[PDB]
Amino acid sequence: SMENKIVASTKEEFNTWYKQFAEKHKLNNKYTESASFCAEIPQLDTYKYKMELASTDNERDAIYSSALIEATRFCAPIMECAWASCTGTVKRGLEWFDKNKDSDTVKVWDANYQKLRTETPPAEALLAYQKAALNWRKDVGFSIGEYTSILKKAVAAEYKVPGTVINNIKEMLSDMIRRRNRIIGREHLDWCREFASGKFLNAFNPPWGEINKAGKSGYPLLATGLAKLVELEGKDVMDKAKASIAQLEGWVKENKDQVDQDKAEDLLKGVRESYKTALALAKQSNAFRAQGAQIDTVFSSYYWLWKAGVTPVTFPSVSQFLFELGKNPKGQKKMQKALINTPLKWGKRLIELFADNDFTENRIYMHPCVLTSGRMSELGISFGAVPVTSPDDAAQGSGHTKAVLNYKTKTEVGNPCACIISSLFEIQKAGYDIESMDIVASEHLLHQSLVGKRSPFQNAYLIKGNATNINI
């Protein structure tokens, strides 16, 4: 029969289920964050040599698919993949969109889907989508632990890798930075940075004279400074800036005997108008057109099942399909063939969520709610690592890109994560031209790592700072 064998309406029930599954299958925490089937860190070099030899494109596609599935299939985070694929999570997760379909943080991208299959979205729908992701995650009750949670935290100053891969990791980082810069004062900027975090009393003594003083742009100096800040150091600055204003206010309230009321209230007014201007400038930053479009995998996955008309009953067959897909990969053509050929009804309805082929602008600007053939992997890691009609078959392994994130980054085992990311990167270099690719998947895996992301089921959006500023 086609049924969901993982039956839990609550984190507790699932916990029981998974203690049992984990013990039966000897899930192991050696090299992976979450317990998994991973006994040994894969060796991808043979794919590197083979890839050095390949004279045709199809072969390079197959060699990279192979390399990927080889590095992935046994490292999937069984606990979170399972939890995300269980009965309760599937019921609530699908039911969320029926209640929230018409809300203002959903309707913006949803009702506009067909359009989004072609043209890049405004900033508004990016913000909306991210809010909706966090909301679905709160309402559904998706967090059973740190690997399913919302990550709010500062990007670590340093990223440790072993001397074997340090070369590679660095090359990747430089190409990444080059790419970010491609996506897009002196005293003023440092005064703005100091104000944004440490010194809010700096607002009493602006370097340019009056705090709200306009520059060559007619835009306030503070505003553009903060903007350039969000650009270089990441949007965290804005929050920090606001925090500082908070302090300012607090101070003005705690000691009001030291200040003149009228011009204190005008000071505050000023900093606030400047901050609103800085926000507005950063929302259109065009660097927000990218970072805003960062996908929330499980959320977009459930959105896709919903949009494709999937339900608790038919979900197990999708889980099944995905599971097979993690064994026998399919490029564009093969995916389309498979999806149209299946007698099952969600197959055709999936490809009708696919964007155009044939999508004009750069794809990092594509909205995170839109399905494509390359994005099947998201579903792949959500519902596919563990087939829910036959959970034990998970022991065979199902390769899905984000599986890489389940690898530990810690130095005692010698950062398997970075090692695999690096092997993938070399392998790609061999057969493909790096600089000329719209996206580089190993690079995005790396981006996810540097930013402190240990799971596919973690939400990385609210993280503090820019991964490109990291020292490795």
Envelope shape = globular
Q: Provide the CATH architecture of one domain.
A: Up-down Bundle
* Count of helical stretches: 21
CATH topology descriptor of one domain? Methane Monooxygenase Hydroxylase, Chain G, domain 1
Structural class based on helices, strands and sheet pairing: mainly alpha
Radius of gyration: 24 Å
SSE succession: HHHHHHHHHHHHHHHHHHHHH
Tell me the distance between the termini.
51 Å
* Quaternary status: monomer
Please count the beta strands (DSSP E, at least 2 residues each).
Answer: 0
Amount of helix:
40-55%
CATH class of one domain: Mainly Alpha
Beta-strand level of the residues, as a percent range? under 5%
The largest sheet is: none
Descriptive account of the structure:
- Helix content is about 55%, strand content about 0%.
- The chain has a domain at about 175-290: Methane Monooxygenase Hydroxylase, Chain G, domain 1.
- It has about 475 residues and is an all-alpha fold.
- It has helices at about 10-25, 45-55, 55-70, 80-85, 85-100, 105-110, 115, 125-140, 165-185, 185-195, 220-235, 235-255, 260-285, 290, 295-305, 315-325, 330-340, 345-350, 375-385, 415-430, 440-450.
- Helix 1 packs across helix 4 (about 80-85), helix 3 runs antiparallel to helix 20 and helix 16 (about 315-325) packs across helix 19.
- It is found in: Virion.
- Pfam families: Nairo_nucleo (PF02477).
- Keywords: Capsid protein, Helical capsid protein, Hydrolase, Ribonucleoprotein, RNA-binding, Viral nucleoprotein, Virion.
- It comes from Hazara virus (isolate JC280).
- Belongs to the nairovirus nucleocapsid protein family.
